[PDB]
Paper text:
Even though constrained helical interaction motifs generally show a tendency to inhibit PPIs,1a only very few have been reported to directly target transcription factors with sufficient affinity to enable the inhibition of complex assembly.12a, 14 The nuclear transcription factor Y (NF‐Y)15 is a trimeric complex (NF‐YA/B/C) that binds to a particular DNA sequence (CCAAT box), thereby activating genes involved in regulation of the cell cycle and DNA repair. NF‐Y subunits B and C form a stable heterodimer, which by itself does not possess relevant affinity to DNA target sequences (CCAAT box DNA). In this study, we aimed to inhibit the interaction between the NF‐YB/C heterodimer (light/dark grey) and NF‐YA (green) to prevent transcription‐factor assembly and DNA (blue) binding.
Two derivatives of 19‐mer peptide 2‐D were synthesized, one lacking α‐methylation at position 272 (2‐DN, N‐terminal X) and the other at position 276 (2‐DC, C‐terminal X). When superimposed with its crystal structure (orange) in complex with NF‐YB/C, the NMR‐based conformers of bound 2‐DN (light orange) show a very good overlay. Notably, 2‐DN binding provides a thermodynamic profile similar to linear peptide 2, and it shows the highest entropic penalty (−TΔS=16.1 kcal mol−1) as well as the largest binding enthalpy (ΔH=−24.8 kcal mol−1) in our panel. In the presence of peptide 2‐DN (c=10 μm), we observe a considerable loss in the fraction of bound DNA (32 % bound DNA).
Author numbering:
A (entry chain C): 36 to 119
B (entry chain B): 57 to 143
C (entry chain A): 302 to 319
Write the structure that this text describes.
């Protein structure tokens, strides 16, 4: 539940945040928030990909199910470059 | 750099029905997506902090960046997870 | 394109190329 989320490595999240050219200091709170955000994001992304998995009559979720979902949901537009 | 794929797989499998299956290539892809989710929020929060010559990205910055970029629905759950966490 | 995201997406493209 939330405990699944507690298992997410905060250091890994801090390291990603620190790739950003304008980030020196980061509050402790930030990676924690991202940990949970990561969970909500992944869940909705996959639910939405799953729709396309099933429309295609498969029980296996594939990179193109993700790609279709990114295009049908305006909230996933920032992913356009990630999943061509 | 990315979150462990084991972690990502377990969240994805909770999302789908028991019966279902996830191809490794779909897990690697969600891996990449998550890193980009983080960088994209961070980038927004960070550009804001620089404009007001602020040297730390705080949790409020992130939460406001989400709101602004159309992840407003994430805000109450994140806040509550924070409360709960450091309660 | 999501109007809320658009400007941030254009910037991020610049950041990733670098
Ligand atoms: Na769109």
């Amino acid at each position: 539940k939330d405990f699944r989320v507690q298992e997410l490595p905060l250091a890994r999240i801090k390291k990603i945040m620190k790739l950003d050219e304008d980030v020196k200091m980061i509050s402790a709170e930030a990676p924690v928030l991202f940990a949970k955000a990561a969970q909500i994001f992944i869940t909705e992304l996959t639910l939405r990909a799953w729709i396309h998995t099933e429309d295609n009559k498969r029980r296996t979720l594939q990179r193109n199910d993700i790609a279709m979902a990114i295009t049908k949901f305006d909230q996933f537009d920032f992913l356009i470059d990630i999943v061509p | 750099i990315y979150l462990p794929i084991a972690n990502v797989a377990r969240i994805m499998k909770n999302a789908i029905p028991q019966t279902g299956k996830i191809a490794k290539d779909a897990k690697e892809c969600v891996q990449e997506c998550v890193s980009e989710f983080i960088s994209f929020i961070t980038s927004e929060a960070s550009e804001r902090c620089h404009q007001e010559k602020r040297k730390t990205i705080n949790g409020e910055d992130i939460l406001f960046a989400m709101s602004t970029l159309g992840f407003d629905s994430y805000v109450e759950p994140l806040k509550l997870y924070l409360q709960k966490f450091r309660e | 394109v999501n109007a809320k995201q658009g400007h941030r997406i254009x910037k991020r493209r610049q950041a990733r190329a670098k």
